[PDB]
């Protein structure tokens, strides 16, 4: 009976290895085995509906990247929006930002801090997805009720547009990341993105290995569930200024230290200064004054500057060898190198400038982001660098930086509304911006908050007009334009599936019903 | 609880309820139960729900509107972004069952307006909007107070606390369900709720066909149960009664004599019962259109009529002397009486029993054929009035004459009755009415006493329109669409939300953090 136990195990391990050899995974590094995955499984395998959508999303993005084109979309609020988006956009984005103000699982709104319960964004995914599935059924019923020659004038909308959803930073430790991933897969996510900030928190990043572990945790949970779920890695290193801890050597090139040995450690100072009553913007001015005085820099620059100013001969020679031996090495090894080339230990204190929470100062910018992107690359299907402004030159630089090492790496891009597409750009450049970016390998792009803003705008316009000219505003600003533009929803009973469900009930009750919603005198006959 | 007193606590709480019920809020309200009965259903942890504050405010608003023959008007709200923009211009909010069905089922399974979502659905939407209203109200107080008085003049001063009126459908089941649903609504934030005289299980949008009503007494019971639960909880919650009688053609049962004048019967004694025909047709394989035609022409042959009309018809056609006289006396003695009693009158006046069978035309579910219309609706509304704070009749068109006819009908009996009106997008407004009348329709209806009016589905359609428009343009000219169609009209009309970090409360929470950290 444990005979079978082992055979069942081996056969399922074999099935997983076969799956893993599929082209979906050719750019994917797994730091675990099929045996380890399968032994985490139970005996009731499930093929999740979302898996179909993950596979669909993969083919789309593969297609786009190969043709150096882009799929682009925006953050969707709710099902009405998603049924209209489905006409023109081939993917759907679910935004953590929009969810915080609009869809917290506990109904408590607030700013974008990822401090809603973590059910929030997965629930919204299920919200939209379940609606997509419904309208898909609705439409198949309507199309199949007439012969194919009479279908040319019927809508043929693809409602099954793959959803990509915000996973924030994973909402806790690695086991939270896996449970969160699990939720997403069962709710309908085709893909999720996870960013290298620290939860509960200038932005604060986590060490490179910690985000890598997050990505591995996502993949592992997907593997356990048999899902082709896409994982998108986002880095906030472009504008980040802080780092939670310093134990990852791949980070050491971007950790800023104090080069001023006169200074008392910042935390000790701020602590003492808070006792003395002193507070508010005066503590903040102390911190700023201290930081300025500290002449922050990387260890490598600190070594080069010390070389430039000290008693040494052949200064260009010492520098080039220090670079040759120390760059991209841990700080502990860079120090040993420097001591042996300089005959002394130069002064460099990266603990002194730490914040009240113990965060290290980070040299953020495009370089930092590229360094992180390259390390994340084999653990994610696409990479995304959060952008301060829509800067094409910077987008080119990040793309080149990543592609110099991973030329096939799919990129994602945030076309953000926090920008001002007016002062940032003239009109014809705006019209081509997505297409130009697509050339660089940005194959999936999105406006995080367009759902928020379109809703805000129409609601303010209509409510205002409504309160001034009454019912006339409805005809003029809503219903007549719906009619002229042949919007779906204007015949709202049909759109909502009234016919679909009448036909359902008639099927169970002998082909007729005394209480058919769309019979007799529905007032939708007032609409052509 | 210690005994010895127990009665004392009971009798002091009873007095408090009696004092409460004497407030002018209740001057038109009939309660068929006592304060003693209500208090003895309570526990020992009384709660004043936040929704009660909103109910009192809504009441104050509607009193003012009706007394001045003006109206508050609003529309169905989808989600919090919408409600923060509505708040600037509209002093109430509507939460729609229709919209909830397509966009907010508690189980995420959408569908047409049949109230077949879990009944948690519309209360959850009420809470969704209300928790957001509360939040933005907090956000704004912090923002305004953070500067001194003399420089708040330009700051936003939006009233986010707009009272919510919510859709209770038919009550989602029996009276114990109605009370549990009412309880939810009250704890979620409702200032008022509406409930209609349809049967659950068959419930339709008012502008769908196939509507089945319940007896007048059953809807009365629903309304009393709502009030009882509000009374148990100490809320001033408004209750709005909706009747679907204007277009309904069916009735769930005929037990209530107040319905009898509107129930259609067969006058053809040659016919077998319709259902028996249907059963035989089905039992031998007939279905679909073939089955429907059997029903259709059976109904034609049956010459459907009310019993009163059948009596008049029989007088007109029979051997009688002084036919105007018997008609006079019949109408008089039979009006508003049960069918049983009206039959007895007709037998006495005519000397024989005329043929009349309203069982015979019943549907396969056992529903009766109803003679719907404005008269049927006025009858129901007049009966509902002592049990609700406003009345609403669904109509097929935005028709001023019928709206007036309904108002006159109700006010003939209850001159001070608040009315509500559905400004329905199920109407094609362009064909139903000229633009110059559209602009005055609300004001004109308010003169009749329509003091609360609402566009049920404007949330749906506004979102649908701007979404189709933007997604289309976006798909063709990319980010240019975003600057043109969204961002710059936003900046131009000074929409709140354009500064999205601030609008969302970033400053509010930042200041919270600073407070609990330093
Ligand atoms: Mn409704």
From Swiss-Prot, chain B:
Coiled coil stretches, renumbered: none
Gene3D superfamilies: 1.10.10.850, Phosphoenolpyruvate-binding domains
Cellular component GO terms, alphabetical: glyoxysome
Record's function text: Catalyzes the formation of succinate and glyoxylate from isocitrate, a key step of the glyoxylate cycle, which operates as an anaplerotic route for replenishing the tricarboxylic acid cycle. Required for growth on ethanol or acetate, but dispensable when fermentable carbon sources are available. Also acts on 2-methylisocitrate.
Primary gene name: ICL1
Keyword DNA-binding: no
Family in the record: Belongs to the isocitrate lyase/PEP mutase superfamily. Isocitrate lyase family.
Organism encoding this protein: Gibberella zeae (strain ATCC MYA-4620 / CBS 123657 / FGSC 9075 / NRRL 31084 / PH-1) (Wheat head blight fungus)
Keyword Ribonucleoprotein: no
Listed cofactors: Mg(2+)
Lineage, highest ranks first: Eukaryota, Fungi, Dikarya, Ascomycota, Pezizomycotina
EC numbers, comma separated: 4.1.3.1, 4.1.3.30
The protein's name in its UniProt record: Isocitrate lyase
One GO MF term: isocitrate lyase activity
UniProt keyword terms in alphabetical order: Glyoxylate bypass, Glyoxysome, Lyase, Magnesium, Metal-binding, Peroxisome, Tricarboxylic acid cycle
GO BP terms: glyoxylate cycle; tricarboxylic acid cycle
SUBUNIT field: Homotetramer.
Residues that hold Mg(2+) according to the record: 167
PROSITE patterns noted in UniProt: ISOCITRATE_LYASE
């Amino acid at each position: 009976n444990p005979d079978i136990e082992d055979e069942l195990f081996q056969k399922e391990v074999e099935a997983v290895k076969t799956w893993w050899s599929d082209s979906r995974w050719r750019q994917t590094k797994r730091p675990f085995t099929a045996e380890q995955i399968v032994s985490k499984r139970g005996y009731l395998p499930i093929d999740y509906a979302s898996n179909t959508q993950a596979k669909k999303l993969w083919k789309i993005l593969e297609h786009r990247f190969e043709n150096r084109d882009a799929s682009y979309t925006y953050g969707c609020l709710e099902p009405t929006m998603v049924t209209q988006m489905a006409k023109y956009l081939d993917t759907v984005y679910v935004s953590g930002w929009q969810s915080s103000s609009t869809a917290s699982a506990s109904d408590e709104p607030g700013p974008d801090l990822a401090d809603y319960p973590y059910t929030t964004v997965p629930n919204k995914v299920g919200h939209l997805f379940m609606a997509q599935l419904f309208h898909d059924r609705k439409q198949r019923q309507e199309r199949l009720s007439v012969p194919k020659e009479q279908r040319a004038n019927l809508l043929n909308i693809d409602y099954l547009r793959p959803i990509v959803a915000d996973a924030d930073t994973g909402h806790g430790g690695l086991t939270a990341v896996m449970k969160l991933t699990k939720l997403f897969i069962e709710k309908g996510a085709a893909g999720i993105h996870i960013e290298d900030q620290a939860p509960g928190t200038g932005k604060v990043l986590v060490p490179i290995q910690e985000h890598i572990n997050r990505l591995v945790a996502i993949r592992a949970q997907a593997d356990i569930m048999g899902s082709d779920l896409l994982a998108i890695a986002r880095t906030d290193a472009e504008a980040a200024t802080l780092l939670s801890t310093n134990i990852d050597p791949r980070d050491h090139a971007f950790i800023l230290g104090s080069t001023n040995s006169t200074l008392k450690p910042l935390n000790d100072l701020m602590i003492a200064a808070e006792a003395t009553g002193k507070s508010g913007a005066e503590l903040q001015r102390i911190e700023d004054e201290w930081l300025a005085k500290a002449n922050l820099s990387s260890f490598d620059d600190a070594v080069a500057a010390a070389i430039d100013a000290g008693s040494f001969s052949d200064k260009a020679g010492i520098k080039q060898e220090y670079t040759s031996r120390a760059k991209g090495k841990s700080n502990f090894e860079a120090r040993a190198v420097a001591r042996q080339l300089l005959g002394r230990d130069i002064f460099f204190d990266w603990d002194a400038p730490r914040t009240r929470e113990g965060y290290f100062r980070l040299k953020g910018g495009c370089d930092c982001a590229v360094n992180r992107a390259i390390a994340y690359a084999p653990y994610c299907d696409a990479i995304w660098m959060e952008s301060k402004l829509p800067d094409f030159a910077q987008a080119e630089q990040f793309a080149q930086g990543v592609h110099a090492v991973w030329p096939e790496k799919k990129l994602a891009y945030n076309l953000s509304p926090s920008f001002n597409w007016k002062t940032a750009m003239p009109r014809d450049e705006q019209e081509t911006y997505i297409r130009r970016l697509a050339k660089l390998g940005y194959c999936w792009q999105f406006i995080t908050l367009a759902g928020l803003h379109t809703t805000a705008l129409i609601s303010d316009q209509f409510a205002k007009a409504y309160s001034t000219v009454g019912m006339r505003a409805y005809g003029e600003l809503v219903q007549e334009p719906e009619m002229d533009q042949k919007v779906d929803v204007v015949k709202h009973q049909k759109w909502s599936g009234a016919t679909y469900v009448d036909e359902l009930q008639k099927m169970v009750t002998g082909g007729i019903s005394s209480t058919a919603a769309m019979g007799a005198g529905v007032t939708e006959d007032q609409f052509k």
